Structure 1
Amino acid sequence: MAGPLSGLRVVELAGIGPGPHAAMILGDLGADVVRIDRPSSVDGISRDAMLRNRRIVTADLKSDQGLELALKLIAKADVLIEGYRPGVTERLGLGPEECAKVNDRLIYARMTGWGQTGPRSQQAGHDINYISLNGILHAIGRGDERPVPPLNLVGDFGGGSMFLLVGILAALWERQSSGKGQVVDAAMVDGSSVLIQMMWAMRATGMWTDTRGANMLDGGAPYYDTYECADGRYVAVGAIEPQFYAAMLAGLGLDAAELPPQNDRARWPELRALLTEAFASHDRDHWGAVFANSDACVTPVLAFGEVHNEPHIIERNTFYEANGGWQPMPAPRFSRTASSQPRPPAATIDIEAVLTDWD
């Protein structure tokens, strides 16, 4: 199996959102990932590209046979991933303490939103809930409107699966001294809070306020925002540094002497009005040309369906084609032990066949 995690063995108790995303990435980087789903489920080969780089197996974990086979897989593996509510694996007989009895090398990775304990620890939730409690959601969107969810990128993935991954891999490094596994407790409410550490840093030094839409990086700054062009499509401007901002102004045709200072916040309304009228005067693809190879920090805001036509995307093979759609190639990239193209979802395998393989 190609990639730096060749030889790493992972058991994933099938759930939704962060658990499978983390499992995907371990698979992507060469891990041997076996996913146990319920029989009531799997009516064919999966159509869900997120289940790439998997072997799927079926097993009623409520039955004693189910549990036994499961504990035999875990015995032969380096990592377990579960993202059920706290208590669920315990009650199945697949809890950490049970796992520690058949494999004290196990990295026992627990993916939740609220964490393992505390008042919300049994409440159902999704991304939007976890980021609502720690200040993140409130910071996202225009100042004249209610907050807008940043899809499920910040709680589920950035602050969720990715922290689970770092935990697993950090724990494997620990396991190199100690010869012992341990439990990784990844909660979206915690990981997302470390994800936004910069805002907490800036808040402390007076460089970030709680007012939505009134900061340097939330859309409040005219030089860090999107602009509507003549065709109704958009560009993004990120020209924070003064030298990049000056480069942007020259490409737009605006003389710096006729504008308010870049960082005179009291005159941001005027500045925005000027930049707005300028970008509105030509179409997105015009601005893409003007600013290609410039440091002006102006880029076209492409829709998903146009991404496959962008030269920089094509040339670095950020994406590959698979069963009626582009999908992203593994990230990040490795010079010597490169990942390979992901293996698509495969039909279910037998749990005995797998135990054989793992010897």
Structure 2
Amino acid sequence: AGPLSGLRVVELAGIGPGPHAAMILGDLGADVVRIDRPISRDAMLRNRRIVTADLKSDQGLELALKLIAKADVLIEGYRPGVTERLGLGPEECAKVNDRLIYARMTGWGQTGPRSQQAGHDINYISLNGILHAIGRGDERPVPPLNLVGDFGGGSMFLLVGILAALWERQSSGKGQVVDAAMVDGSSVLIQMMWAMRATGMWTDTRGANMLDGGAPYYDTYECADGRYVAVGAIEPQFYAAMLAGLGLDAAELPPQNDRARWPELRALLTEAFASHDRDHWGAVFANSDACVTPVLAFGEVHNEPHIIERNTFYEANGGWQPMPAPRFSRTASSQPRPPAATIDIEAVLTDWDG
């Protein structure tokens, strides 16, 4: 029901970014067909049809090619060379479908000294300065889950590449190959820090900057009950609203941006936030511009009113799952269809007319 209704996608079963990108297309209305080796409980595989094929066999290669012959997009996330040796590489695909957006999702890229090397998110972000910048200054870097490599700088860039190439195709009449490497996407994801580095506004010191937990006004605080609030009161007026709620006299504190006294500032705020429960502060700052919010664990998210009101999550069999994003005023997406039984590839071919 979304904006991508009409769009046909072949997804070669992979892990991490590939399936995430395929899920978002499906979310937004795309007809995604995932080819697996010969009924799912991975919510990630919502909004598909699943077929099965041995791509190492003559019959399996031939069917996949018939399916690809009728697709708009192909998603693959294997090592470079893998689809080639299978006979499903870009050059082989062009012979059956020159309108195909051949989307290749990797960590290191299609080429380069590391392109044949195994890796995971933490590796791609360690090589480009990102991982080094995450965590407290007094200890080793901490991975920001696999949000930055696999998803933010991964599947999200594959998607931009895919949708950008479809725009191109409206005038060229032709597809092309999208080489989405997590080491690249994630660097453009963090371009703000690269920009700020050049103007003296970000340093290579972990835990000592405006947005990394270094600023007492941009960090979490432990409250009386061991639970946490997030403070993000960057602007002076929001910061002022923040002090007031805490019952602190501004004239008694160090200036917000005297970094020399940041330890003193943080200590006073720590004492303030520790004096009451997280839910107390959420009540104090409920409607304010203080940029103070309760840090909710996954299990609690479903009870937060702004989360509820906006239907950010739906209940899908044994748990909450995020509704599609972003939102569209005219061609709104449907609630995702759950993973179902595998179906006959020929039936998919029949549907598509292949």
Q: Which of the five TM-score ranges fits, normalised by the shorter chain?
A: over 0.9
Q: Which residue of 1 aligns with 2:325?
A: 331
* 1:119 CA drift (Å): 0.7
For 2:92 and 2:171, the matched residues in 1 are separated by: 23
Q: Deviations over 1:262-297 (max 9, x none)?
A: 000000000000000000000000000000110000
Q: Deviations over 1:114-153 (max 9, x none)?
A: 0001111011111000000000000000000100000000
Q: Which 4+ stretches in 1 moved above 4 angstroms?
A: none
For 2:139 and 2:341, the matched residues in 1 are separated by: 47
For 2:94 and 2:351, the matched residues in 1 are separated by: 23
Secondary structure in structure 1 of the residue aligned to 2:126? helix
For 2:111 and 2:173, the matched residues in 1 are separated by: 28
1:16 pairs with 2:32:
no
TM-score of the superposition, structure 1-length normalised? 0.98
Secondary structure in structure 2 of the residue aligned to 1:299? strand
For 2:158 and 2:82, the matched residues in 1 are separated by: 18
For 2:244 and 2:195, the matched residues in 1 are separated by: 33
Of 270, 295, 311, which residue of structure 1 is paired with 2:264?
Answer: 270
* 1:236 CA drift (Å): 0.1
* 1:51 CA drift (Å): 0.2
For 2:344 and 2:92, the matched residues in 1 are separated by: 24
Q: Which residue of 2 aligns with 1:42?
A: none
For 1:8 and 1:118, the matched residues in 2 are separated by: 32
Superposition map of 1:281-292 within 5 A: 281-292=275-286
Secondary structure in structure 2 of the residue aligned to 1:209? coil
* 1:174 CA drift (Å): 0.2
Of 166, 186, 199, which residue of structure 1 is paired with 2:193?
Answer: 199
1:140 pairs with 2:139:
no
TM-score of the superposition, structure 2-length normalised? 1.00
* 1:344 CA drift (Å): 0.1
Point out where structure 2 has 5 or more consecutive residues left out of the alignment.
none
For 1:249 and 1:10, the matched residues in 2 are separated by: 52
Q: Deviations over 1:4-49 (max 9, x none)?
A: 000000000000000000000000000000000001xxxxx11100
Q: Deviations over 1:162-182 (max 9, x none)?
A: 000000000000000000000
For 1:134 and 1:82, the matched residues in 2 are separated by: 24
* 1:255 CA drift (Å): 0.4
For 2:158 and 2:349, the matched residues in 1 are separated by: 26
* 1:347 CA drift (Å): 0.4
For 2:23 and 2:259, the matched residues in 1 are separated by: 44
For 1:94 and 1:125, the matched residues in 2 are separated by: 23
* 1:349 CA drift (Å): 0.5
* 1:99 CA drift (Å): 0.2
* 1:155 CA drift (Å): 0.3
Secondary structure in structure 2 of the residue aligned to 1:102? coil
Q: Which residue of 2 aligns with 1:102?
A: 96
* 1:197 CA drift (Å): 0.3
Q: Deviations over 1:312-350 (max 9, x none)?
A: 000000000011000000000000000000000010011
For 1:295 and 1:130, the matched residues in 2 are separated by: 37
For 2:246 and 2:254, the matched residues in 1 are separated by: 15
Secondary structure in structure 2 of the residue aligned to 1:226? strand
For 2:14 and 2:77, the matched residues in 1 are separated by: 6
Q: Deviations over 1:43-97 (max 9, x none)?
A: xx11100000000011000001000000000000100000000000000000000
Q: Which residue of 1 aligns with 2:2?
A: 3
Secondary structure in structure 1 of the residue aligned to 2:237? helix
Secondary structure in structure 2 of the residue aligned to 1:309? coil
Secondary structure in structure 2 of the residue aligned to 1:327? strand
For 2:294 and 2:104, the matched residues in 1 are separated by: 39
Superposition map of 1:346-357 within 5 A: 346-357=340-351
For 2:6 and 2:267, the matched residues in 1 are separated by: 57
For 2:234 and 2:139, the matched residues in 1 are separated by: 25
Q: Which residue of 1 aligns with 2:301?
A: 307
Secondary structure in structure 1 of the residue aligned to 2:50? strand
For 1:319 and 1:235, the matched residues in 2 are separated by: 22
Secondary structure in structure 2 of the residue aligned to 1:227? strand
